[PDB]
Amino acid sequence: STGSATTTPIDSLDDAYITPVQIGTPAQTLNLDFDTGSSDLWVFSSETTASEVDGQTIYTPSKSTTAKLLSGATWSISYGDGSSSSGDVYTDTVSVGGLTVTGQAVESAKKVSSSFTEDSTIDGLLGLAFSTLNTVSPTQQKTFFDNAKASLDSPVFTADLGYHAPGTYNFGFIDTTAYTGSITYTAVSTKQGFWEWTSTGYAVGSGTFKSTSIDGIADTGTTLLYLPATVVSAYWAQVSGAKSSSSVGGYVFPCSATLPSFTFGVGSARIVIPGDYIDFGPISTGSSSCFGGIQSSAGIGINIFGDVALKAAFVVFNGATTPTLGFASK
Numbered sequence: 356s357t358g359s360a361t362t363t364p365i366d367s368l369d370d371a372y373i374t375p376v377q378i379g380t381p382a383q384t385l386n387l388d389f390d391t392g393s394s395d396l397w398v399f400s401s402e403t404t405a406s407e408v409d410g411q412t413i414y415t416p417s418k419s420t421t422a423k424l425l426s427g428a429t430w431s432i433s434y435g436d437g438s439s440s441s442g443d444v445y446t447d448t449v450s451v452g453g454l455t456v457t458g459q460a461v462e463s464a465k466k467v468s469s470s471f472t473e474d475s476t477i478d479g480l481l482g483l484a485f486s487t488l489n490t491v492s493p494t495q496q497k498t499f500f501d502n503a504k505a506s507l508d509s510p511v512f513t514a515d516l517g518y519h520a521p522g523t524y525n526f527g528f529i530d531t532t533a534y535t536g537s538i539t540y541t542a543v544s545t546k547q548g549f550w551e552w553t554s555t556g557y558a559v560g561s562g563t564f565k566s567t568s569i570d571g572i573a574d575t576g577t578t579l580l581y582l583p584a585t586v587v588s589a590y591w592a593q594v595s596g597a598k599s600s601s602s603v604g605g606y607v608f609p610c611s612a613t614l615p616s617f618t619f620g621v622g623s624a625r626i627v628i629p630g631d632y633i634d635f636g637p638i639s640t641g642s643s644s645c646f647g648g649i650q651s652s653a654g655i656g657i658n659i660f661g662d663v664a665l666k667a668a669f670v671v672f673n674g675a676t677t678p679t680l681g682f683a684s685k
């Protein structure tokens with residue numbers, strides 16, 4: 356079997372991407388944030404605290420004839436950005452672009468933190484990191500990818516995020532028309548539950564390539580590219596007027612600037628992020644100071660190859676016996 360679904364940026368900045376997901380019987384379509392940095396499929400629901408729902412589409416398990424309460428199961432997650440959500444669990448039919456999983460754990464939110472409520476475009480998350488990070492207690496649950504894997508034509512999923520445009524998430528196959536050149540595969544460590552790999556270095560604009568090992572995670576659920584301070588300082592040193600701002604909480608730069616590109620290494624291959632991908636607009640409405648798309652990972656503890664990096668490439672999340680990551684230009 357295969358699945359194919361269009362992913363769409365939630366706003367003019369590509370702050371996040373939403374993909375329609377069918378849940379239950381009859382189908383209840385919710386737009387979820389496919390996140391390769393977490394392993395919980397959670398949704399806004401009829402059980403979510405009323406004051407914490409503001410515009411989101413909710414899943415109502417009582418209206419689904421295939422929904423079954425997972426007795427005694429609860430979930431509670433806290434994300435790297437300080438957001439959090441928790442609630443109870445149901446098992447139900449979940450479909451992504453033609454691909455169907457019966458008995459998938461659908462985590463129904465009872466409580467969500469402010470950032471989730473404030474984002475009316477995101478109805479929940481669909482985790483695609485390793486099932487070892489799933490928060491369901493006392494019985495840990497599997498991800499949608501893990502549940503579909505045995506049924507897929509090939510045990511893979513691909514991320515093809517667009518820059519200010521729609522993209523695609525494919526399950527079970529590699530679309531050879533969606534990229535240029537060839538796909539370079541690289542080693543993955545699953546020890547932290549993430550799609551964690553090692554980049555072979557970087558370049559800033561037309562600059563000379565620096566061979567240096569950068570350990571980080573391929574994370575579709577993170578907007579920006581978080582890299583070591585030395586690397587991020589080398590990047591922003593090429594932008595006239597760019598500075599690290601403690602009040603804004605990152606590198607900011609004149610909105611009038613034209614940004615240089617950023618290249619990252621995948622083995623002997625190179626993914627080039629065009630400069631326009633690194634512009635995240637005014638720091639506050641009407642400001643002439645813009646927020647950068649390349650930020651330091653010093654406060655995080657892990658480097659994150661978020662959407663800024665991933666959207667410049669066709670990305671293969673290979674769930675074979677030994678998982679690997681494939682990257683190709685497009």
Ligand SMILES: c1cnc2c(c1)ccc1cccnc12
Pocket residue numbers: 368370578579603635636637638639646
């Ligand atoms: C991810 C994280 N932080 C941001 C954005 C995206 C976009 C704009 C912005 C403006 C000021 C401060 N942070 C951000």
